[PDB]
Amino acid sequence: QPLNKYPVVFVHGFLGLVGDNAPALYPNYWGGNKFKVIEELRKQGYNVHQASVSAFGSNYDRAVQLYYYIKGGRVDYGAAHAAKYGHERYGKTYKGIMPNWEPGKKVHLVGHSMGGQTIRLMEEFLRNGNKEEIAYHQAHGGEISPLFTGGHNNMVASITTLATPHNGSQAADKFGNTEAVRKIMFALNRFMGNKYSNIDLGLTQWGFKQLPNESYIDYIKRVSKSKIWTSDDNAAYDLTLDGSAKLNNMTSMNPNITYTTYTGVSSHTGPLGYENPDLGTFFLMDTTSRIIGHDAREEWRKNDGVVPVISSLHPSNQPFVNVTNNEPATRRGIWQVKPILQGWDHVDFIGVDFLDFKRKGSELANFYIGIINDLLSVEATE
Amino acid sequence: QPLNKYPVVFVHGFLGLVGDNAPALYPNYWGGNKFKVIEELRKQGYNVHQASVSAFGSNYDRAVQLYYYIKGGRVDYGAAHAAKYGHERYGKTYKGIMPNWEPGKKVHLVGHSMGGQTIRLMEEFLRNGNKEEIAYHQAHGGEISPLFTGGHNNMVASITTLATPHNGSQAADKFGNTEAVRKIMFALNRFMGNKYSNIDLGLTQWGFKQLPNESYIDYIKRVSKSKIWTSDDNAAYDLTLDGSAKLNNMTSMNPNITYTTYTGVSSHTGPLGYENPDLGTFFLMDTTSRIIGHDAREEWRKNDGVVPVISSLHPSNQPFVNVTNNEPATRRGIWQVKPILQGWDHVDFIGVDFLDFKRKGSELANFYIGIINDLLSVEATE
Numbered sequence: 108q109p110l111n112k113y114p115v116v117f118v119h120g121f122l123g124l125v126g127d128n129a130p131a132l133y134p135n136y137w138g139g140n141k142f143k144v145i146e147e148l149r150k151q152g153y154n155v156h157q158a159s160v161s162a163f164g165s166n167y168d169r170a171v172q173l174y175y176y177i178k179g180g181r182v183d184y185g186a187a188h189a190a191k192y193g194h195e196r197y198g199k200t201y202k203g204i205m206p207n208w209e210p211g212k213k214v215h216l217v218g219h220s221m222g223g224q225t226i227r228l229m230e231e232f233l234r235n236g237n238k239e240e241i242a243y244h245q246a247h248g249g250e251i252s253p254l255f256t257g258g259h260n261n262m263v264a265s266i267t268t269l270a271t272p273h274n275g276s277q278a279a280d281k282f283g284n285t286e287a288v289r290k291i292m293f294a295l296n297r298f299m300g301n302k303y304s305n306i307d308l309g310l311t312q313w314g315f316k317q318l319p320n321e322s323y324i325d326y327i328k329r330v331s332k333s334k335i336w337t338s339d340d341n342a343a344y345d346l347t348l349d350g351s352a353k354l355n356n357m358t359s360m361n362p363n364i365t366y367t368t369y370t371g372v373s374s375h376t377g378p379l380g381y382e383n384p385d386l387g388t389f390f391l392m393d394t395t396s397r398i399i400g401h402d403a404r405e406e407w408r409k410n411d412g413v414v415p416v417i418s419s420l421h422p423s424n425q426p427f428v429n430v431t432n433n434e435p436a437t438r439r440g441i442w443q444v445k446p447i448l449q450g451w452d453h454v455d456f457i458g459v460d461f462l463d464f465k466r467k468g469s470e471l472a473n474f475y476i477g478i479i480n481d482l483l484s485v486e487a488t489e
Numbered sequence: 490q491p492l493n494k495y496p497v498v499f500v501h502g503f504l505g506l507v508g509d510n511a512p513a514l515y516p517n518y519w520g521g522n523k524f525k526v527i528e529e530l531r532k533q534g535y536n537v538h539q540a541s542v543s544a545f546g547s548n549y550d551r552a553v554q555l556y557y558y559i560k561g562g563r564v565d566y567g568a569a570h571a572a573k574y575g576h577e578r579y580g581k582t583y584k585g586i587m588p589n590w591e592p593g594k595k596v597h598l599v600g601h602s603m604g605g606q607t608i609r610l611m612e613e614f615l616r617n618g619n620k621e622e623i624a625y626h627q628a629h630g631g632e633i634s635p636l637f638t639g640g641h642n643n644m645v646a647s648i649t650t651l652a653t654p655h656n657g658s659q660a661a662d663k664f665g666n667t668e669a670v671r672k673i674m675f676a677l678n679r680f681m682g683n684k685y686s687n688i689d690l691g692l693t694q695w696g697f698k699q700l701p702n703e704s705y706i707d708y709i710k711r712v713s714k715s716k717i718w719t720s721d722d723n724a725a726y727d728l729t730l731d732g733s734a735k736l737n738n739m740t741s742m743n744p745n746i747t748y749t750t751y752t753g754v755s756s757h758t759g760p761l762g763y764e765n766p767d768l769g770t771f772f773l774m775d776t777t778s779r780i781i782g783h784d785a786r787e788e789w790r791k792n793d794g795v796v797p798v799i800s801s802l803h804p805s806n807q808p809f810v811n812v813t814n815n816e817p818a819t820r821r822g823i824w825q826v827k828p829i830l831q832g833w834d835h836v837d838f839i840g841v842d843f844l845d846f847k848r849k850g851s852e853l854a855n856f857y858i859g860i861i862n863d864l865l866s867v868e869a870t871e
């Protein structure tokens with residue numbers, strides 16, 4: 108029936124809310140009003156889906172949630188992980204988009220922003236498992252999630268990343284992960300955990316769900332005891348240079364997977380050799396762009412608004428090849444780095460920059476159809 | 490000891506709220522965050538003020554309110570007018586900025602957008618009065634407002650208009666004044682009349698003030714009987730081509746007043762000869778710009794976002810002279826039309842376009858100081 112033999116799963120980044128979990132008024136994550144990725148690709152005969160995972164949680168938590176979003180079942184973060192970081196072991200339960208997912212039935216994974224990192228970690232778990240959970244279950248018995256066992260291959264065909272901070276971002280180090288802004292983020296999470304809330308911002312495993320008979324005052328008191336306030340097990344930490352390097356250090360290339368990256372630049376060189384945001388950078392990224400663009404290290408300056416070029420091209424010290432727009436992107440086991448998209452800021456990739464008239468719907472349609480063509484090529488050359 | 494002998498009164502347009510009457514979060518009308526007109530001009534030693542008049546009412550109602558804002562006292566719309574249109578005769582009461590205002594003590598009037606029309610009408614009333622009110626008080630006795638008497642000269646030194654729709658706008662004819670959008674406007678007025686409201690949107694004379702012990706249900710029922718819903722005595726009507734022509738037809742040049750206009754363009758010619766909004770036009774004016782720019786009559790196309798050039802230059806039936814940036818603007822009795830400001834949309838005149846980095850604070854400062862210099866020169870050449 109579908110043109111693509113393997114389902115495409117699109118994985119949103121940090122802050123992203125999709126589908127039923129998006130607020131009453133809120134942008135459509137995958138394509139804005141410019142090109143409705145899920146709906147349009149379906150109309151054209153492709154089998155595609157948008158994952159829904161934690162908007163504020165760690166790559167770890169998100170990767171576990173991604174697994175269950177696909178397979179179905181009750182999210183299990185692992186006994187060792189839960190005990191180490193101080194959050195619930197078990198989380199939400201998903202219906203599952205492919206309940207028969209197993210070695211032999213493959214999926215294509217495309218990640219925007221942090222979605223790119225989350226995808227890598229989950230493949231890591233399928234192939235190699237999670238050593239601390241393996242050790243924990245050896246020592247103490249119990250059940251261990253099949254996600255943490257290792258030895259599950261032939262499950263992902265491709266990893267494509269768009270504006271992913273593979274090497275982290277200074278906008279995290281110098282803003283997102285500061286004490287003041289973690290508190291803002293966590294307060295937002297506390298609030299949207301109130302008993303009248305219909306949206307899940309992705310930190311309920313830390314206690315941010317008010318009980319039906321609990322007063323707001325008691326709720327405040329209870330969740331102020333949570334480890335979230337001081338933990339590194341959250342998105343803010345993971346998006347830092349250190350946080351991203353840690354993930355780089357525990358990932359490896361899978362020789363059967365087709366890897367490809369896209370990167371935008373939306374800054375220009377000023378006097379002194381610093382980078383400033385172009386007119387047309389979505390305005391909410393103006394200051395973050397300046398922070399990145401005024402780095403002491405010249406090669407860390409050019410950026411898409413919130414992620415520097417050098418972070419998006421590929422994980423540093425993993426094998427890559429610079430590739431053309433025209434040739435097949437069909438090499439396995441190596442990061443195929445696509446030519447930089449000039450004038451594309453971080454959110455132009457997902458079409459939500461309603462202020463930017465240079466970035467047209469028809470252009471974004473071509474961009475997505477291009478990705479699908481590459482995916483079709485991957486299928487054709489097994 | 491102010492540098493200017495005559496006080497400068499700035500008069501906002503349609504939708505504008507100022508001072509204490511602005512919502513919790515709302516732009517600073519005169520200068521945005523780019524150049525604080527009132528505060529900065531005061532620091533430099535000028536006596537300036539921002540009038541506060543109805544945001545949604547007619548030029549008539551606004552012009553009465555302007556009079557009382559300056560002179561002080563209880564707003565009196567006139568018995569004949571009240572009876573003809575179906576609203577209260579009396580309105581709010583103002584402290585007065587110049588309680589001694591009379592022939593001999595003059596004021597300079599500068600109006601943005603509809604503010605420009607309001608200023609013309611008020612001076613018309615001072616000089617020539619209101620014949621229907623004169624006739625009504627002849628027939629029925631009682632008190633008549635001094636504003637309606639006629640014979641008051643030597644009270645206004647200058648009339649300067651910025652992006653004023655002297656000849657109306659299609660954005661009114663084809664949108665603002667349609668049935669569906671009048672209802673939206675009136676509903677907003679109804680709501681902001683509720684008993685917890687601290688802001689006056691300028692239509693309480695029509696009944697839109699909920700009583701302290703009245704239920705919302707009863708309020709809805711009462712104000713649905715108001716004539717507002719079908720009247721032309723409102724801003725939406727007055728901003729139309731017909732509405733503006735009517736005002737033109739009943740105003741005249743005062744030979745002792747210095748008249749000057751400014752106009753912006755923020756559209757560009759497309760291949761068919763239609764006008765489209767520049768990048769940089771405040772995005773809320775995007776559609777209104779297209780509507781104006783696709784007019785059948787070519788000379789009605791170029792626009793500032795919501796006002797076509799032909800409308801802003803000067804009232805079409807009144808004398809004008811095209812003037813240079815450098816000529817002293819000291820001619821009396823004729824509209825001195827200042828050269829068009831390229832790239833300035835409707836709201837760039839008041840500095841509220843936070844999305845437009847090409848329009849800097851220092852530019853806006855020069856523009857306002859320019860106006861003051863012209864006003865100073867009007868004083869110097871009596």
Ligand SMILES: */C(=C/CCCCCCCCCCC)CCCCC(=O)O
Pocket residue numbers: 119120121122123219220221222272276278279282283288291292346395413414454
């Ligand atoms: C996904 C991740 C990359 C961003 C790295 C920068 C961290 C700065 C944090 C600011 C904190 C605000 C409380 C990007 C997904 C974008 C989706 C959207 O804009 O809706």
Ligand SMILES: */C(=C/CCCCCCCCCCC)CCCCC(=O)O
Pocket residue numbers: 501502503504505601602603604654658660661664665670674728777795796836841
């Ligand atoms: C003052 C007058 C220019 C109005 C032109 C035409 C009417 C368009 C309809 C809008 C519909 C309302 C729902 C402009 C002063 C603007 C001030 C501000 O935006 O703060």
Ligand SMILES: CCCCCCCCCCCC(=O)O
Pocket residue numbers: 294295297298
């Ligand atoms: C639009 C932002 C509104 C202002 C936020 C102030 C409240 C700070 C933190 C609130 C925490 C909570 O309600 O649980």
Ligand SMILES: CCCCCCCCCCCC(=O)O
Pocket residue numbers: 301302303321322323324
């Ligand atoms: C005493 C417990 C407090 C309950 C949570 C407060 C929720 C605030 C917002 C609710 C909005 C609504 O009810 O529609």
Ligand SMILES: CCCCCCCCCCCC(=O)O
Pocket residue numbers: 676677679680
């Ligand atoms: C941004 C808020 C928009 C909500 C619009 C719905 C309300 C329609 C009419 C309400 C009239 C009234 O409450 O008197």
Ligand SMILES: CCCCCCCCCCCC(=O)O
Pocket residue numbers: 683684685703704705706
């Ligand atoms: C009979 C009901 C009349 C009062 C309803 C007015 C609605 C205003 C809501 C604003 C809430 C507040 O700040 O109290």
Ligand SMILES: CCCCCCCC(=O)O
Pocket residue numbers: 322
């Ligand atoms: C402004 C808050 C309104 C709803 C509060 C519900 C009360 C409760 O939790 O018992």
Ligand SMILES: CCCCCCCC(=O)O
Pocket residue numbers: 488489
């Ligand atoms: C040059 C070595 C590449 C791997 C061979 C894959 C065979 C195929 O085309 O299915």
Ligand SMILES: CCCCCCCC(=O)O
Pocket residue numbers: 504505506512544690
């Ligand atoms: C909840 C408060 C709403 C304020 C409406 C202001 C409209 C205007 O700009 O004229």
Ligand SMILES: CCCCCCCC(=O)O
Pocket residue numbers: none
């Ligand atoms: C959602 C409405 C909250 C305010 C209650 C109105 C009070 C009253 O007039 O009785």
Ligand SMILES: CCCCCC(=O)O
Pocket residue numbers: 122123124130162299
């Ligand atoms: C009430 C709206 C929630 C904000 C969701 C976000 O910023 O990801």
Ligand SMILES: CCCCCC(=O)O
Pocket residue numbers: 512513514515516
């Ligand atoms: C133009 C802005 C209006 C919003 C008014 C408020 O939320 O208080």
Ligand SMILES: CCCCCC(=O)O
Pocket residue numbers: 773774776
């Ligand atoms: C002046 C306000 C008009 C809003 C119309 C639009 O957003 O297309």
Ligand SMILES: [Ca+2]
Pocket residue numbers: 387388389450451452455460463466
């Ligand atoms: Ca952009």
Ligand SMILES: [Ca+2]
Pocket residue numbers: 769770771832833834837842845848
């Ligand atoms: Ca502008």
Ligand SMILES: [Cl-]
Pocket residue numbers: 208209210253259
């Ligand atoms: Cl499995």
